[PDB]
From Swiss-Prot:
Disruption phenotype: Embryos arrested at various developmental stages, mostly at the heart or torpedo stage. It comes from the Eukaryota. Expressed in the whole plant with highest expression in imbibed seeds, embryos, endosperm, and root tips. It is found in: Mitochondrion inner membrane. Cu cation binds at residues 35, 39, 124. Residues 1-160 form the Thioredoxin domain. It comes from Arabidopsis thaliana. The chain holds residues 172 to 332 of 334 of the full protein. This is Protein SCO1 homolog 1, mitochondrial. One of its GO terms (molecular function) is copper ion binding.
């Protein structure tokens, strides 16, 4: 299946693995803090989806932001960024090699794009992964989903699992 072991650094400075995410339903979003529109929109969608899922099903789903820009996105940078969207949003970062291993595992494309206004941007896969409480992949959610189609979907999966 899509995913596998990782050793990353959480927004609090603690070193984590896939085992630190176990025990709760999880949604993983790969992004970068310097993203102008895509990532802020997707996370806003995710944060509002987290709350709607809870209201409708009673299930606490943990949103997870994984950085595809480790050169700029430090622990302090990721921490400050994640706190803006939802109080329950975990931020994961690491070494460019650590990030390479986890993106590979999740089949995520990421490539630095030179920019004049930004120093550069990271071109990447606009993806969400609904992992279960035993960290096994359940469903994928693309850019085309709205808060309602994400909520409805996640809620449908949880009940059938
Ligand atoms: Cu982005």
């Amino acid at each position: 299946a899509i995913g596998g072991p990782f050793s990353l650094i959480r927004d609090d400075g603690k070193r984590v693995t896939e085992k630190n995410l176990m025990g709760k339903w999880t949604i993983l979003y790969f992004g970068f803090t310097h993203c102008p529109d895509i990532c802020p929109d997707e996370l806003i969608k995710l944060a509002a989806a987290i709350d709607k899922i809870k209201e409708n099903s009673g299930v606490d789903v943990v949103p997870v932001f994984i950085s595809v820009d480790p050169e700029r996105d430090t622990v302090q940078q990721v921490h400050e960024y994640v706190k803006e969207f939802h109080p329950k949003l975990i931020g994961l970062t690491g070494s460019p090699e650590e990030i390479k291993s986890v993106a590979r595992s999740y089949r995520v494309y990421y490539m630095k794009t030179e920019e004049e206004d930004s120093d550069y941007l990271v071109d990447h896969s606009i993806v969400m992964y609904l992992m279960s409480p035993e960290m096994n992949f359940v469903k994928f959610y693309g850019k085309n989903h709205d808060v309602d189609s994400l909520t409805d979907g996640v809620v449908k999966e949880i009940r059938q699992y």
